[PDB]
Amino acid sequence: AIMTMLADHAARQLLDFSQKLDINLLDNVVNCLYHGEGAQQRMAQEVLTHLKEHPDAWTRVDTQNMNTKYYGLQILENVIKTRWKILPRNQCEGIKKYVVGLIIKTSSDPTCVEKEKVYIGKLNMILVQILKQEWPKHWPTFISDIVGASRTSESLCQNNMVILKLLSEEVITQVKSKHLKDSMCNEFSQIFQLCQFVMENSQNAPLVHATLETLLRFLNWIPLGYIFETKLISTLIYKFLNVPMFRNVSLKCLTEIAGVSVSQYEEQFVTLFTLTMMQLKQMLPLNTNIRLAYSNGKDDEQNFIQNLSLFLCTFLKEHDQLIEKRLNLRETLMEALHYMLLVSEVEETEIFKICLEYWNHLAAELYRESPFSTSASPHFDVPPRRQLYLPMLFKVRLLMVSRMAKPEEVLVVENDQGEVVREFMKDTDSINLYKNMRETLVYLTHLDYVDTERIMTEKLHNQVNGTEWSWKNLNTLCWAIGSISGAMHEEDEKRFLVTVIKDLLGLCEQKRGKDNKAIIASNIMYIVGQYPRFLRAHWKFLKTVVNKLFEFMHETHDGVQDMACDTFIKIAQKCRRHFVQVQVGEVMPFIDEILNNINTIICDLQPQQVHTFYEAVGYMIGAQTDQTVQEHLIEKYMLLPNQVWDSILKTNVRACKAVGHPFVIQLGRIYLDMLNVYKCLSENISAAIQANMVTKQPLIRSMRTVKRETLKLISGWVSRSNDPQMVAENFVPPLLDAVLIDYQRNVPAAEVLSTMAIIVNKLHITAEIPQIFDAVFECTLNMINKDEYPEHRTNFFLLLQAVNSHCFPPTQFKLVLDSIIWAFKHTMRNVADTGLQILFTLLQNVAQEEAAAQSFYQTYFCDILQHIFSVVTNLVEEGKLQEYVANPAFKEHLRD
Known part of the structure; x- marks a missing residue:
């Protein structure tokens, strides 16, 4: 292990000697990749070498060359962000010129393409990071420079298209962006002109792809004159729409063109639509089922469809009126609508929301045109707008019903194998999907409740029959009905709803096993919850329902009971008035029946499921007045748990907050x-x-x-x-x-101090001030004004706030004001803004009285100004300071 020491000592010396050697640098970066210890040691060595300074990096690049390219580019890129503000502008602009030159050199080389342009990409990223900070007040000519330098070569120009894309990625407000457009337009026209040249003159596909990419991105900012006053539209229609290589990047452009608000140009938009359709019917056949093709559709094949939806939505939302207007165009618009309806059948998360975004708008407009539904057979004057979309409306109702999402309310989900269970992988995406579909379906139902009724009834008969009966197939329908809540009128809604309920109960009767019963119960519960206005009309019906709930809380299958409690609360909330009274059908109040049968119901429930139940019952009984009767009923309600208290309290306060104010009959005893x-x-x-x-x-x-x-x-x-x-x-x-x-x-x-702060808003607290601000004030500041106690700080300031705001010895007042000023000196928000409000109302109190109008001015007013002065960054002028201080518009003047 002797060589380790040698290798370790070798690297440290070459960095501080200002003499760098290429081969030795090459060996190490390979060693780290191909060794275990070498990786760690050499990485540490790398951050250690990076810390020093840049000077060696550039000359390292000038003279293996690709790994150390990643390396040296890391060096430069990192040192730039750090010292870009420190260095003189000229030197850093020199580094910039070096970067530009390196870029032109390495992009102009053919072998770069054989190098696969990784080095090109990282280099580009460096250019990006520099341009990001430099651009605003250093390179006003950068645009025109790249535009000019793209006029010589291919590699140069296309690489500069890439640069323009990245520039579009590193470039908030409406007005400021409009000023941006107006200021940059002169510099934009050239950027459009270059792409204009390349699209008409070039032969290179890889250049053209990047050109249409960057033109797509930059289209929004480039002036209208270069767009609709030229042959750009027709050019995109005939030339770049047909070709497969561009089929999915061209469409986007057209979409971006549609989103432009018609001002002086109208016809060109009609031309755009007509031609886009003329070429789309050829590109894709009308007969083609989009869903299956999308299923077998490649990665590229999908983007075309998604962009079809995107385009159709984006254009129709803006100019559907313009297309309607002409009589000739009417047919073409019908055809396009058919296309969109076809695309609306793709089973995918994104595209669905994309075309739904259209459906919403569509329903909305012709609903705001005519709020009343078309016919009821049980004479012209048909709405003009409706007339056009008329034979295409029922399809959307048929579609929307069968395809809507799981509500945020219910908890029932099928696994891929077919197992039923509750799950809450809940993101608001699917939920907003749900609500949007709901609104849309209501809009459409307001157009003709009859068609909706028939549409649902038919499939319901098919469900009672058993034909095509799968849990999902019923789920969709039930969710669909539960979103129609309050679409049809009372007299019709009854007649339609009762059938649904009866057939639903029969459907629950036929189905066997827990697997079916869970689904049916779920659907029936949600479908009940959304209709309180029907249940409050018919008593015995509601009775049947609530009894079905209570009976369903006896179910063993998890998720079902927990839902049934929620549904119970949801029914209690709106039907609170129908539960207490003795109804025409039944001699005994329902609540009275519940309070004796509760023992058998609540045994199968979870404790948490029981708390909600108690809150529900409390909400029911809290609705009755009738003097002493309801009090007696409360007594009976709480007689079971409360009795063993005299001879735990959590459930008691639960019931307290649940029932409400009439808790006095039990609170008092x-x-x-x-x-x-x-x-x-x-x-x-x-x-x-x-x-x-x-x-x-x-x-x-x-x-x-x-x-x-x-x-x-x-x-x-x-x-x-x-x-x-x-x-x-x-x-x-x-x-x-x-x-x-x-x-x-x-x-x-x-918690003693924060409690009495509330009653101030309710009650009469003045006459207790000398007793309240005595024992808990001066002797408590010793615990809270020394610096400590995160709980007390959210208590005292609130009390002082309420007392000071609602109703306005000195030794007890000074320490108060000193506390107020002490509030906004903290780092915690809930202990800071309080003092802002307290002081805001403090000066606004003593200034309205007669007696103590000058006792607060002479003694305190100028003594408080000095304290707020340090936290910042009409009384003296009105004769109710300019030297003492020096020794909306008012806010902008101080902040500036």
Whole structure:
């Protein structure tokens, strides 16, 4: 292992001696690749060599040559970003000239193509990294320079097309970009002219591909005169559309042309459409099934189709009106529409959203034209716009129904082998797919609910029959109905919906096994959830449904019950008014029936699934008034868990936030005991520390948790209450002795402050200020104004904020203001902006009164200005400073 030392000592000396040798450099970079230890040691050596300085790199390139090319290019590229601002502009521009020269040299060589242009690519990247920082205020002529230098050779020009592409990659706002266009237009016209030359004169395919690429990218910015006033359109139509080599890069261009807003040019757009169709019908046959061809379609073959959709969407969205207008064009537009409908059948994530993007718009427009549905047979005046697309609308309804995605609501998914199970690989992409299809289908359903009804009914009969019955085949349909929620009118919606429900129940009756039952239950649940307006119309129907839910929460197959609880909440939320009352069909209230059958239902559910259930029931019972009756019902509701408390609290506060304000009937009977025992626990803790780090003990935390959960409960009820009159006079007074004195009696080591901050918004807090801002103020700043305690900082400032804003001894006030100013000096946002608001309302309070209008000016006003002065970066002028300070428009003046 002696040679290792020699090799190690060899490399270190050559770097600091300013004399570089090529062969020795070559040996090492190969050694690292072909050795184990060599890799690590030589890499460390490489960062060590890179740290020094560049000077050797360029002359290393000047004089193996490809690996060290990657190396030296790493050197240069890295040193550039670092010292581009440090170095003088002329020297770095010298390095730039060196880069340009190297580029021209190596691109002008034929062997570069045999070198496969990796070195060319990296070199280009260097040029990019330089150009990125240089361009704005160093090279105003760069454009014209490359344009000029591309007029001699092929390799040069095409490599400069690559450069222009990369420049388009390294070049926010509408207006500023429009100023960009107007400022750069003069320099753009040349860039268009070059490509204009190459497209008409060249023979080289690899050059032309890059040319149409870069012209595609730059098209958006190049002036309109060079586009529609020339033969560029016709040129792209006849010459570069037919040829396969360009078939998928040409289309894009045309798409980009369609996206231009018609101003002075109208006809040329019609010509564009007519000719694009004329050539597309030849390129692709009308009879051809797009889906199958796309399936067997190669990597290149797909881009043509995706671009077909992209083009058709992009053009129609802008000028479909212009095409409609003429009578001749009407047929061609029908044909093109047929094409798009065909392309809309490709089973792929991207293309679907691409053509859907059209479908949406289409439905939208002719819906905003005529909101009313066409016919109901159970006389002209047909909407003009509708008339045109008329025999092509029903196809979209037939299509949209059968193809929509899984809702965010349901949790049922089939695996490729055919297994049913819930899964949540959930990205908002598919969800937005869902919602967009939903909106579209509603737009289309508003055009004729009759056709929609028939379309769904037919497939439903085919499903009851069993013909072509697969879980997916029903899933799609049910999801489709669940998106029609509120499309048809009441009297029709009933008549249509009842059939769907009955046949659905029958379909659940026929199907056997858990594999079917899970799917059917899922579909039926979602399809029920979306129709509260129907269920509130018919009582016994709703009864049947909710009973089917309760019966479905007895299911063993995972995912189903968890969904059924969600559906239950979704029904409770909107049908809260139909549950309590005694209905015409049933003598006993449904809630009353539930409260005694709950024990058998909730045994199969998960605990988390039970909490939601309790919240739902609470939302049901919280709807009734009827004076004492609902209170009695609440008593019955909570009588089971609450009874064992007198002779856990988490579920209690769950029910508290769930039911709402009318929690007083249960809150009151257990209220005083809480204070009575809390008064003892507080003394337990305080005496525990007084005779001893006890806060670290488990028992003390366990005793303080009670103290917290007691306060948070009052926080909840008061936050959700609507009777300040009762709160302020009844529940508020029993806090002075039990809570306020507790903070004083308890040790600093052992949520009390942040809780009382809320009631200020609700209630009457002024008369308690001397009691509140006493024990928990001056003796607490010793814990929070010393620098510490991330919890307390999100509490006190809020209380001070509310108290200072809602209703406006000195020793207790100074320390307040000093705290306000202390707020925006932090690094935490929630402890900073608070003081901004508090101070903003502070100066806006004492300035509106009569008595203390000058006591805040002379004593504090000029003494506060000095503090805010350091955090920045009308009272003196109005006679309610210019020397003391020096010794929207106002914001821009200070920031500048």
